[PDB]
Amino acid sequence: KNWYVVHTYSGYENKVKANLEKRVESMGMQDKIFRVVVPEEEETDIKNGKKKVVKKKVFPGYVLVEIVMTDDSWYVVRNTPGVTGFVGSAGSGSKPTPLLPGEAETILKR
Amino acid sequence: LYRRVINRNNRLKRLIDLGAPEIIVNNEKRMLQESVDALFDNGRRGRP
Amino acid sequence: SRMERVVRERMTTQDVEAITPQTLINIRPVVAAIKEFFGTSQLSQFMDQ
Amino acid sequence: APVTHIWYFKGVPSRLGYLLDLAPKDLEKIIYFAAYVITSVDEEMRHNELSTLEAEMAVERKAVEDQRDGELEARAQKLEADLAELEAEGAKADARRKVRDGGEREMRQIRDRAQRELDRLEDIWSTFTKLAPKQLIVDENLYRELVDRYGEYFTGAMGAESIQKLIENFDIDAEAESLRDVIRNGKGQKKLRAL
RNA sequence: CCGAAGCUUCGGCUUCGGCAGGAGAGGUA
DNA sequence: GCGCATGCTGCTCTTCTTTGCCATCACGGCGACTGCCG
DNA sequence: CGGCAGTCGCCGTCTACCTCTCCAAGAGCAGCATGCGC
C-alpha cells in the first residue's frame, strides 16, 4: 500500500475525490483502495473581517491515493468520471511509479 | 497555441518555486514540451 | 451509445432509494447528434429550386 | 525549462541524431521523459578505486551468504527436532518422507532468493564496469541503485536539459577527423554511414 | 483614406465618426 | 431584531487520451531502418 | 559481424470564376440579496 498520484482536470479535484470514495464504497473493492487526499492549504485571504479564502492548492490538478496495484484497481481508479490519467508511468507505461517514503511523509504532514 | 504555452509555463514556474516532488515536475515539463511542439508543427508527432 | 455510457458511469455514484429513470438519463448527446447531422453534413444538401 | 525544436529531431533523417550518434527512438524516449542517459562518467577514480569497490561488494556478498547459511542452520535444527519427535515412533513416516522432499524444496526456495540477491549485485557490478557517456539506461531502479551506491564519479538525467549537456560537452574536430579516417580506409556499410 | 462640422490667409488647420477570417456542398468554361 | 441559509448572477476558465473510442485512406517513388536470418 | 528484405513513413497529384449554409456550450466558483427562524 504505497501512495500514488493521479492527474485530473483542473477544478475537478474535490469532485474526483468524492466520486472515488463513493465508487470505493459502492462497487465493492474496499480492501484495495484505502485513502484519498487532495494536498491543499488554507491561506490568510481575508478582507476586513470578511474572509475570502479560496482553497489554496499546492499542486493544482493532482490527487493522492493509497492503493495496492492489481489489474482491477487500475481499471476502477483510472475510469473515475473526471481523472485524466495516472502519472509517473515510464517504460511503455506498464505500471505507475510509486512515491517516496519521506516525500509522502512531508506532503501528509502539512 | 500561444495561450496553451503560457498556461503551462506559468504552472511550471509556480510548481518549481514550491518544493514539488520530481514526478509532478517531470509531468509538467513533458506537457510543456508537447505544447511547444504542437505550436511549431501540429500533427507531426502524436495526434493533432 | 454516448447516453448509455453516461448512465452506466453515473449509476454507481448516486445513492440508492433515490434512483429513478428520470435522474439517470441525459438528452444532450442525442439532440447534439441530430442537429449535427441535419446541419453540417455532406449528405443533407441545400435544395435546388 | 529548455525545450527542443521539432524540425531538427522529427525529420528524415534526424539531424540531432546524426550529430549526436543516437537512434531516433532513443532521442524520443529521452526527450519525452521515459528513460535516462549518462551525460558524463569519470574514469580515473574508477581506475584507482576498483580494488576497494570489489572488496566492499565481496564483503557484502559473503555476509549475505553467511546470513543464508544461518537460516539454513536454524531450519536444519528445527527439521532435526521434527525428525526426532516423529520418525522414532508410530508417527506417519510417509509424512516425514514427503517432509524431506519438501525440505529439498526449501533449500531450492531459499537458494532462489540467494540467487536473486547475487544476480542483482553482479549486474550492478557489470553496469558500473561498462559505463560510457551517451548510453541509455532503462529500468529506473538500476538508476536509483547506481546513483545512491556510487552516486559520485558520474552524472545524468532525462529531458532536453540532459541533451543540452551532451551538446555542450561535444568536440567537433575529433569526431570530424574520426569520420574522415573511417571514410579514408574502410569498406562495407560503415563507410556509407560515415558519408 | 472617406464623410459630417467649424477656422480658412485658400497652402491648408482643427473636432467627431468608421472595417474585411475558415469549413462543407453544388455549378460554368 | 439579528444571523444563517440558498438561489440570481457576475465571472472567468475548461475541455484527457486506457484495459477506450475509432473508422478508415488511393497510388507511385524514394529512402532509411530495423528486426531477422545466416 | 554481415547481408537482407519487408516495411513504414513522407512527398506529390491544372487555372480562373459564381451561388448557398454554418463556425463550444454546459459546468463550476465564488459574491452577494433576501427570506425565514429563534
Swiss-Prot record, chain A:
Please provide, in alphabetical order, the Gene Ontology terms of the cellular component aspect for this entry.
cytosol
Biological process per Gene Ontology, one example term: DNA-templated transcription termination
- UniProt entry keywords in alphabetical sequence: Transcription, Transcription antitermination, Transcription regulation, Transcription termination
Question: Has keyword Disulfide bond?
Answer: no
Is the keyword Transcription in the record?
yes
Functional note: Participates in transcription elongation, termination and antitermination. Stimulates RNA polymerase pausing at U107 and U144 in the trp leader. NusG-stimulated pausing is sequence specific. Does not affect trp leader termination.
Task: Family membership, please give it.
Answer: Belongs to the NusG family.
Report what the protein is called. Transcription termination/antitermination protein NusG
Shown stretch of the complete protein:
3 to 112 of 177
Swiss-Prot record, chain B:
What job does the chain carry out? DNA-dependent RNA polymerase catalyzes the transcription of DNA into RNA using the four ribonucleoside triphosphates as substrates.
Similarity field: Belongs to the RNA polymerase beta' chain family.
The protein's induction, as recorded, is: 6-fold repressed by starvation.
Domain of life of the source: Bacteria
State how it assembles: The RNAP catalytic core consists of 2 alpha, 1 beta, 1 beta' and 1 omega subunit. When a sigma factor is associated with the core the holoenzyme is formed, which can initiate transcription.
Residue span of the signal peptide, if any?
A: none
What name does this protein carry? DNA-directed RNA polymerase subunit beta'
From Swiss-Prot, chain C:
Effect after changing residue 46 to V? In strain: RJ37; rifampicin-resistant
| Quaternary context | The RNAP catalytic core consists of 2 alpha, 1 beta, 1 beta' and 1 omega subunit. When a sigma factor is associated with the core the holoenzyme is formed, which can initiate transcription. Interacts with CarD, TRCF (Mfd) and RbpA.
Q: Which family does it belong to?
A: Belongs to the RNA polymerase beta chain family.
Role, per record: DNA-dependent RNA polymerase catalyzes the transcription of DNA into RNA using the four ribonucleoside triphosphates as substrates.
Know the name of this protein?
Answer: DNA-directed RNA polymerase subunit beta
